[PDB]
């Protein structure tokens, strides 16, 4: 048994700082809604399950949202602009929608505290970041550039490159840190700290974020006949394995984010980030800029 | 003599669809203004020369603009938001500012016809583009990906990869085209079609755009004692060599854009684009996304 066996892709629950919905196609009837919807959205699961999405959307953004949701080109279209009209009182969300195993999953995170131009911060992050990565003259300089850039953009206490060896053991080959975070640079860890089914999932889904390791999972409720494990492999809000939360607690880490580094189709390593005290809800534009930099680094892993 | 000798970096004039200003430091007094300022800005050179920039800027965007102009971090801060208050009647511009040879040059192009979210189109362009470039499995697939993406983003009739050989002759090794543009794929051209001082300039300044080859150059006027050739090497609006305009006329090309491809610090090739009929004022976000893709391709020129 041991670590390789837990089915981390179907926990039945999400991290409660966003809301997860499942939408029928083509009608966009909600078949599933996470149970934190009252706190986040201002509606109960009973109001949600079996209602059409449009009923809750401010009418002027409604048709474009529905058009996007039916597009597949789906992302490419993320993030979706979601204005949730309840009281109302519009609430604003970035929607991240994806299709997996026959389900259309729409995840809602509250739109950033504004106020700077939308997507300007992404524009600058990836331009400045690309040119620092291109200054690197070898693999070690690349790693140190990436970790400095990611720590700069996010404000995480620690950011490392964690490289896998042939046996899937890993080592900390680059680190940028606040002084206040103990230095992990140079440490090697056994393969079971990132077990096989996690590594397999992380070859497909290149980003995970845990803005606080102390949260109450919000169960995903479903219409009768629906529900039945929801495959959450590509869902950003997926509740993470409790044994990993305990590992982070024991490391003394309150919040985490990691990004897969790919090479020739195979997981090569991770950019891994920790907040040592306090939480870390990384804004959408920052997270996405960091993933973009990880894709650039992955493409450069030919030098 | 021949082609290598013309001093293309100091033509004394600009392409008239934007305005070029030179600003003193730290006071931001205009020492130079291109003579098309009446058409573009609504002020004469006489009103401009020796006035402080702030006098013309809408007061609520004035302090941040001046702060940026004095920053160096200068870009990194481009584009600058420039609201020009004359009549007034605000007019809106993207400012591209740079320092070169001791001058602070501010170039003003009219802000795009709006209306979509600012920088959203850049966000999508570089994300979708990066993932198509990463699908390429060899140099030829890379070239064909780049040319398809750039043509898709811009709408140019033709987009090619033009690769330099050891003697600086070039060949068209990839092409995407409207059918209506003759195919240049496979053609080789002599080194003098892109002469030595152009190639040297294009190792430093990675983008040039000619939205119409038929334009009246707008001379750059200067305060007494100033003026004296303005080095326009890094200026986007720099008027281009008339012999090159004739070459484009003769190719049957009405508008052009090219991007340098760099490898190990040396010019490797160009992404070159043509509009065969009609003009092509590529919006700022599109141009900048194309340059970003050229930087990615340049970084990948290790495979
Ligand atoms: C057998 C069970 C497990 C033991 C024992 C253990 O130590 N982890 C077990 C299961 C497990 N881990 C993860 C995900 C995971 N683990 C890491 C490990 C590290 N983070 C670091 O910074 C370092 C070294 C400094 C190590 C080593 C990481 C980065 C991750 C990814 C998640 C994150 O970024 O925090 C999982 C999967 C958790 C999930 O996706 O649900 C499991 C089951
Ligand atoms: C000796 C004078 C010149 C002769 C003869 C000639 O043919 N060109 C001469 C000078 C010259 N060229 C350029 C810039 C330039 N030339 C090219 C050439 C090509 N564009 C194509 O698509 C192809 C093949 C299909 C060729 C070959 C290009 C791309 C450029 C860059 C400008 C642009 O993108 O249109 C200059 C410099 C012009 C300037 O920067 O002021 C000069 C002096």
Residue numbers in the entry:
A (entry chain A), B (entry chain A): 16 to 318
From the paper:
Phytochromes are red-light photoreceptors found in various plants and microorganisms. S. aurantiaca contains two previously uncharacterized bacteriophytochromes (BphPs) denoted SaBphP1 and SaBphP2, which may be responsible for the light-stimulated growth of multicellular fruiting bodies. The classical BphPs switch between a red absorbing state denoted Pr (λmax ≃ 700 nm) and a far-red absorbing state denoted Pfr (λmax ≃ 750 nm).
In order to understand the role of the unusual Thr289 in signal transduction in SaBphP1, we replaced it with a His so that the T289H variant SaBphP1 resembles classical BphPs. We denote these constructs as CBD-wt, CBD-T289H, PCM-wt and PCM-T289H. The wild-type and mutant CBDs both crystallize in the dark in the Pr state in space group P3221. When Thr289 is replaced by His, structural displacements throughout the chromophore binding pocket are observed. BV ring D moves almost 1 Å deeper into the pocket, and its carbonyl forms a hydrogen bond with His289 (∼2.8 Å) and with Ser287 (3.1 Å). In addition, the electron density of the water that hydrogen bonds to Ser287 near ring D is stronger in the mutant and there is an additional water molecule with respect to wild-type suggesting a more rigid and defined BV environment. However, the T289H mutation hardly changes the overall structure of the CBD dimer as the root-mean-square deviation (r.m.s.d.) between wild-type and mutant is on the order of 0.3 Å. Since the CBDs do not form stable Pfr spectra, but the PCMs do, the PHY domain is essential for the mechanics of the photoswitch.
